[PDB]
Amino acid sequence: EVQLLDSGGGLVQPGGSLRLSCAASGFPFSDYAMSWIRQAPGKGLEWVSPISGSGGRAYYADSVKGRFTISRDNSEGTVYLQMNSLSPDDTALYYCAKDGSGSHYNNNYFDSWGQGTLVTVS
Amino acid sequence: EVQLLDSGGGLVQPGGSLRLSCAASGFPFSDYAMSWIRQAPGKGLEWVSPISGSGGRAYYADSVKGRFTISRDNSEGTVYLQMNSLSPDDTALYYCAKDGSGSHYNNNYFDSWGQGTLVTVS
Amino acid sequence: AEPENKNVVQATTTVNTTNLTQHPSAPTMPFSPDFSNVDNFHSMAYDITTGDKNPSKLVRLETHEWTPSWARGYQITHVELPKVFWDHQDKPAYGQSRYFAAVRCGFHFQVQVNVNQGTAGSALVVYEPKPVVTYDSKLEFGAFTNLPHVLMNLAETTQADLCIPYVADTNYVKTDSSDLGQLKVYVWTPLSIPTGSANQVDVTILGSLLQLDFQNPRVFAQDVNIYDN
Amino acid sequence: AEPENKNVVQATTTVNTTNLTQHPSAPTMPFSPDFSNVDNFHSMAYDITTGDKNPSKLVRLETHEWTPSWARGYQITHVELPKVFWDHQDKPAYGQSRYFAAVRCGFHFQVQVNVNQGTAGSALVVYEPKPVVTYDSKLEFGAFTNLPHVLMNLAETTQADLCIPYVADTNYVKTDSSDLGQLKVYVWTPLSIPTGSANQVDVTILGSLLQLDFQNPRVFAQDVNIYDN
Amino acid sequence: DLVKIAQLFSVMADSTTPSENHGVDAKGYFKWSATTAPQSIVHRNIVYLRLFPNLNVFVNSYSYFRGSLVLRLSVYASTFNRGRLRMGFFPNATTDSTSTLDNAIYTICDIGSDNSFEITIPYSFSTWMRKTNGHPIGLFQIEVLNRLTYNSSSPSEVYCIVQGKMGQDARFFCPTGSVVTFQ
Amino acid sequence: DLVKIAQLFSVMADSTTPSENHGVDAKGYFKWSATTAPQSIVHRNIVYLRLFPNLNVFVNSYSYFRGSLVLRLSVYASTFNRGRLRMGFFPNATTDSTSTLDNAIYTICDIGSDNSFEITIPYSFSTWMRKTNGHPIGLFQIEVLNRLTYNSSSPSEVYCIVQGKMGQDARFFCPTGSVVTFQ
Amino acid sequence: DLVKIAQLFSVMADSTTPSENHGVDAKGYFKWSATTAPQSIVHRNIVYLRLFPNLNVFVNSYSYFRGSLVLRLSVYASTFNRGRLRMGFFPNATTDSTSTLDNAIYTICDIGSDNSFEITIPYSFSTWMRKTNGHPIGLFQIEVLNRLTYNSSSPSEVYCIVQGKMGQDARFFCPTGSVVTFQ
Amino acid sequence: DLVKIAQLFSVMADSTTPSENHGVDAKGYFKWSATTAPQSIVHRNIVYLRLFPNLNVFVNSYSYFRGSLVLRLSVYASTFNRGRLRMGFFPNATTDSTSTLDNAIYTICDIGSDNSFEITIPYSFSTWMRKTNGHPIGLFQIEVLNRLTYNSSSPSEVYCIVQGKMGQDARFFCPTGSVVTFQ
Structure with missing residues (x-):
């Protein structure tokens, strides 16, 4: 049963850098793709980055690009976001989420979210 | 900060087999040796098995010998006990625990215990 | 030259394609x-050399997507390539290899890009050595072609091979600290896509790391791991 | 024979000891x-062979501790050795190797045990092929010396080399299902330790897996990993 | 001989083809479109002997080996489309993967006027023969790398048809029920 | 030459020796006792040039290379004790480890009357010379495998003294402050 | 020698380039666009030794001659763009002009796949050497004549990068303060 | 041939072994302990063809002769144990006895490092072949004479395993139901 547990978020100065972590359970983690999505106060949801299985291809949103880095540890089934270059636009509640492609298609539907870690870049 | 979380224990028939798991945090898991110790109702503590770092050498107590198998997953920082050949003498509360050798000696002191999983082989 | 040009075209082949x-x-x-030579002072001719299938396979790296749109006016990273591998790509045989002694590295590099006859605007790749590396001061961009510069023409070709021998007089080096060849694949001028061309320049960077010398014996196997730092 | 015996003693050497x-x-x-031959029917002489440093290094396995106390009357497992490696020991170069085609395996095995002049009681090791394997019916124990039996004498020696060529007429095999050589290192009679000997027979089992053939090309590198099942 | 027929460089399922349904049609054809990035996987074809149709009858009519497995691709590009991939294209049943596959047999092709490649897979298998059974002889993977490059152009999509052949051995063994026939 | 002195197979710290304090004494000596199992690690010695005393003066008096590093062990066993280990015994600064080390330079010794082994470490290092600096040239590991085997016997413990030498090159380079001296 | 460096066909400012600012970038690049007529002047580049950067350090590090001045251009055209100019491309400091320049050293190039030309300027100067001073060694002029011709096409603009070299003489004389350096 | 199998110096029941039950185990092993006197009999093994297991299948699968019967012993002594016996070790079915047996085929062994003896029994029998029937082909006797001599020592008991072989004739005759098999 999917349990995605997230730590590491806290208040940070602008220009700062955080490392968020999210740990998974009850699913074969290393087969699934994984994404981070954030939620700004007074805003809806934005997908930020996702990483593919082997820790292979990763994609990012244009806002996050060179500032944020996504890395998996498969040996401990964990997900990492290294947020460099923090600006106030990055303030949000960050969720880790787990996506699946189903059979043999190209869509990746999320099937489980974590609880949310808050990053106040102020 | 060490958090050792244990699942998997439940009621089992004699001749049965369980797989206990214990997951660790807040320490470099893959450097430390790890042991399982159990506690029988109306009994003190018995060390059962320990495993060494790389998942290299493992030792067992004579009672547990060929029946129980200890394996680590370092990529997800987890510890496993595969209990085959269950007999009522194996009923206990099982704890995972984390030991350290300190500087350069030969003693391994435990510095953190988990919460306990119960195995009723009846 | 004559297009399709001799020096051009080109062919790289191994297993199994x-x-x-x-x-x-x-x-x-x-x-x-000027290589300097495979054996120089430096290797007594002593040194442990390779030339084994994993490296010559490929770097097989992925390269940065250049579009119509960057200009002109642009750098690249270095693709030190062993550095790349240690950080990323890692090429299990490569991981095992990385897990050694100062290396003797030539390149041997392939860069493949293809938009379609429709696309035009080259990307100027460069060979500068150990990288002091800052993106501004376009003077650096002006200063190279002096170091291995092959070239990319979307309008004329789908494959560039840039070969590089070995820089660092040291004739053999320590990797975690130093960076031998930095092969920059930059655009001088940008590609512009009209409709009759392919909608995609995804760059690929292949290297081929040829004839690499290593000087301690350690253990070097085609797995990777051991014992570097 | 003459103790210290010719056929005996023995020496195995490689990097770097x-x-x-x-x-x-x-x-x-x-x-x-009777090997059968390195090339048989079977390999056209076609087959991909090895003979590379990782295997000939060692199995370097650890072996079971025999004491005064087991008797008489005892088996061993098989140490299929590739099986062992896949389950355990894995010998990174070995992991990479395992990650291939049917193998052509000879052994080449070393077993080292040493208690001291004080200890006496041999352990009879055995070469039986693909193992039907049940510990009872001591008849099996009686039935071998017929297959590679070197011998251990605590009172006379600290090192046994058992070499084994290749069983399975198949001249090459699929590993996850079949088991070629099972080398059993069992005691016929037990060791008994008086005071003037060393307090420890920890067994070690070394193999050396020699001249191993593999028949698909795959990828075989000295890292390990790929693509077996 | 039977072999030219199995042999004479045939075309392949390979897989079931996200069809138009062009993918029967196809068969030989993975798709070639531009792409958001180039490295991403689009295919993973499984080879047997059984499965994909030309291979099927032959394989049932025999149950051993002699052979190799040559897959040579051809391209329907234009002036205007172009393209490149790399294809593994994989023996026997390994790693399932990127680099492991690149590590494999190997071909690097330019898809311009060359219109043909040779990616030959060998059976790298413990025994000279594999019999006809269900799980798998092993995977052939393709990776399309960089698309097409272009023109105005060509409707965008480009397609390849894969070709299949074995040597060296042309000749097998043991005949068995051939897929086609009467009753 | 200076070299015979550094050279002529000297004995070593190697480490600080859980002493008696026999471990100054020792130096050359890891311990050999019986053991609960045989495979477990008992040592991990770090080599430089700097550190362990004979190596120290030479190393300061020069700061480059020519050399190799031969460590040959000797044993004080008895009839009655015996023993075996394997020692790595490691170039330059790798894996820190079991198999990686076995994968290393290699020697297999019997410790019976032979009373000497050659485990020679080479400097497998990117450059011909490494200069004298602090972090480490690299580790030498020993593993005692199987103890001693025996008699009545010998008090149980057995000890080895390690030997150190380099070729091929005997000759170095650049002289610098030698550890011994006046002022 | 220093010469390969000055020498090995470098690229040039030449001028300050009405920039994008592509014109640092450029440098080598005059612009190639279509044009209302073809003959009209778009450029007039001044050469010294001093000025444009690669030339600058060398020139300061020496103050005499031996040399010639080869400017060879390269083009980034497409199928679709094409282009032609003629470039003078001028010794020493004459006429400043059309025909006078055509009368000059001369090259006629096709800018199709050739992708390189040799327009070499010589120092036609009263004395073998000119020293480094301010007014000017002389002008290089380019004329783009006819644009580009085409397709659908290529975004319209085409660009050239000029190349610079001297023979015959490779070798100069008198060293002097080199542009780069410390203090 | 079948013969190497019967042949290649096998080990023997011989008898049922006052077991530990080491005596299955054993089989090959009479006991070697010290003794109150040395000459006293401790064994009397009966040989056929039938009886003791390796001999059994072969014997049923044939029912004639060609052969000889070689019994060669091996010893697990120590430094510390030693030992000597003499073994008859008896053809065919005579005297049952001391001297008569000594009078027999003969071997005198030292049980120190030699670790092997050849006591070969011949079928000294009226006819070239004896068929498989119940009463007995004849006895092999062993006598342990003097024990072990010693040390501190070795736990006291020492054991031997007997070995069995025939020449000259390797080859028999008439095949018959072999002990192993299906139905």
């Missing part, structure tokens, strides 16, 4: 052919 | 020397 270009822009070929 | 015995009990040496 022949991969054929339309052709290397040009070639960043080998000039005044 | 000479390891010297007191000597192989005896030797389980090579008999009527």
Whole structure:
């Protein structure tokens, strides 16, 4: 049963850098793709980055690009976001989420979210 | 900060087999040796098995010998006990625990215990 | 030259595929052919050399997507390539390899890009050595072609091979600290896509790391791991 | 024979140590020397062979501790050795190797045990092929010496080399299902330790897996990993 | 001989083809479109002997080996489309993967006028023969790398048809029920 | 030459020796006792040039290379004790480890009357010379495998003294402050 | 020698380039666009030794001659763009002009796949050497004549990068303060 | 041939072994302990063809002769144990006895490092072949004479395993139901 547990978020100065972590359970983690999505106060949801299985291809949103880095540890089934270059636009509640492609298609539907870690870049 | 979380224990028939798991945090898991110790109702503590770092050498107590198998997953920082050949003498509360050798000696002191999983082989 | 040009086109083949270009822009070929030599002072001729399938396979790296749109006016990273591998790509045989002694590295590099006859605007790749590396001061951009520069022409080719021998007089080096060849694949001028071309320049960067010397014996196996730092 | 015996003693050496015995009990040496042949029907002489440093290094396995106390009357497992590696020991170069085609495996095995002049009681090791394997019916124990049997004498030696060529007429096999050589290292009779001997027979089992053929090309590198099942 | 027929460089399922349904049609054809990035996987074809149709009858009519497995691709590009991939294209049943596959047999092709490649897979298998059974002889993977490059152009999509052949051995063994026939 | 002195197979710290304090004494000596199992690690010695005393003066008096590093062990066993280990015994600064080390330079010794082994470490290092600096040239590991085997016997413990030498090159380079001296 | 460096066909400012600012970038690049007529002047580049950067350090590090001045151009055209110019491309400091320049050293190039030309300027100067001073060694002029011709096409603009070299003489004389350096 | 199998010096029941039950185990092993006197009999093994297991299948699968019967012993002594016996070790079915047996085929062994003896029994029998029937082909007797001599020592008991072989004739005759098999 999917349990995605997230730590590491806290208040940070602008220009700062955080490392968020999210740990998974009850699913074969290393087969699934994984994404981070954030939620700004007074805003809806934005997908930020996702990483593919082997820790292979990763994609990012244009806002996050060179500032944020996504890395998996498969040996401990964990997900990492290294947020460099923090600006106030990055303030949000960050969720880790787990996506699946189903059979043999190209869509990746999320099937489980974590609880949310808050990053106040102020 | 060490958090050792244990699942998997439940009621089992004699001749049965369980797989206990214990997951660790807040320490470099893959450097430390790890042991399982159990506690029988109306009994003190018995060390059962320990495993060494790389998942290299493992030792067992004579009672547990060929029946129980200890394996680590370092990529997800987890510890496993595969209990085959269950007999009522194996009923206990099982704890995972984390030991350290300190500087350069030969003693391994435990510095953190988990919460306990119960195995009723009846 | 004559398009399709000799020095051009080009062919790189090994297991287990022949991969054929339309052709290397040009070639960043080998000039005044100064390697310094495979054996120099330095290797007594002593040194442990390779030339084994994993490296010559490929770097097989992925390269940065250049579009119409960057200009002009642009750098690249270095693709030190062993550095790349240690950080990323890692090429299990490569991981095992990385897990050694100072290396003797030539390149041997392939860069493949293809938009379609429709696309035009080259990307100027460069060979500068150990990288002091800052993106501004375009003077650096002006200053190279002096170091292995093959070239990319979307309008004329789908494959560039840039070969590079070995820089660092040291004739052999320590990797975690130093960076031998930095092969920059930059655009001088940008590609512009009209409709009759392919909607995609995804760059790929292949290297081929040829004839690499290592000087301690350690253990070098085609797995990777051991014992570097 | 003459103790210290010729066929005996023995020496195995490679990087980067000479390891010297007191000597192989005896030797389980090579008999009527029937391999079947390295090339048989089977390999067209077609087959991909090895003979590379990782395997010949060692199995370097750890072996079971025999004491005064087991008797008489005892089996061993098989140490299929590739099976062992896939389950355990894995020998990164080995992991990479395992990650291939049917193998052509000879052994080449070393077993080192040493208590001290004080200890006496041999352990009879055995070469039986693909193992139907049940510990009871001591008849099996009686039935071998017929297959590579070197021998251990605590009172006379600290090192046994048992070499084994290749069983399975198949001249090459699929590993996850079949088990070629099972080398059993069992005691016929037990060791008994008086005070003037060393307090420890920790067994070690070394193999050396020699001249192993593999028949698909795959990828075989000295890292390990790929693509077996 | 039977072999030219199995042999004479045939075309392949390979897989079931996200069809138009062009993918029967196809068969030989993975798709070639531009792409958001180039490295991403688009295919993973499984080879047997059984499965994909030309291979099927032959394989049932025999149950051993002699052979190799040559897959040579051809391209329908234009002036205007172009393209490149790399294909593994994989023996026997390994790693399932990127680099492991690149590590494999190897071909690097330019898809311009060359219009043909040779990616030959060998049976790298413990025994000279594999019999006809269900799980798998092993995977052939393709990776399309960089698309097409272009023109105005060509409707965008480009397609390849894969070709299949074995040597060296042309000749097998043991005949068995051939897929086609009467009753 | 200076070299015979550094050279002529000297004995070593190697480490600080859980002493008696026999471990100054020792130096050359890891311990050999019986053991609960045989495979477990008992040592991990770090080599430089700097550190362990004979190596120290030479190393300061020069700061480059020519050399190799031969460590040959000797044993004080008895009839009655015996023993075996394997020692790595490691170039330059790798894996820190079991198999990686076995994968290393290699020697297999019998510790019976042979009373000497050659485990030679080479400097497998990117450059011909490494200069004298603090972090480490690299580790030498020993593993005692199987103890001693025996008699009545010998008090139980057995000890080895390690030997150190380099070729090929005997000759170095650049002289610098030698550890011994006046002022 | 220093010469390969000055020498090995470098690229040039030449001028300050009405920039994008592509014109640093450029440098080598005059612009190639279509044009209302073809003959009209778009450029007039001044050469010294001083000025444009690669030339600058060398020139300061020496103050005499031996040399010639080869400017060879390269083009980034497409199928679709094409182009032609003629470039003078001018010794020493004459006429400043059309025909006078055509009368000059001369090259006629096709800018199709050739992708390289040799327009070499010589120092036609009263004395073998000119020293480094301010007014000017002389002008290089380019004329783009006819644009580009085409397709659908290529975004319209095409660009050239000029190349610079001297023979015959490779070798100069008198060293002097080199542009780069410390203090 | 079948013969190497019967042949290649096998080990023997011989008898049922006052077991530990080491005596299955054993089989080959009479006991070697010290003794109150040395000459006293401790064994009397009966040989056929039938009886003791390796001999059994072969014997049923044939029912004639060609052969000889070689019994060669091996010893697990120590430094510390030693030992000597003499073994008859008896053809065919005579005297049952001391001297008569000594009078027999003969071997005198030292049980120190030699670790092997050849006591070969011949079928000294009226006819070239004896068929498989119940009463007995004849006895092999062993006598342990003097024990072990010693040390501190070795736990006291020492054991031997007997070996069995025939020449000259390797080859028999008439095949018959072999002990192993299906139904």
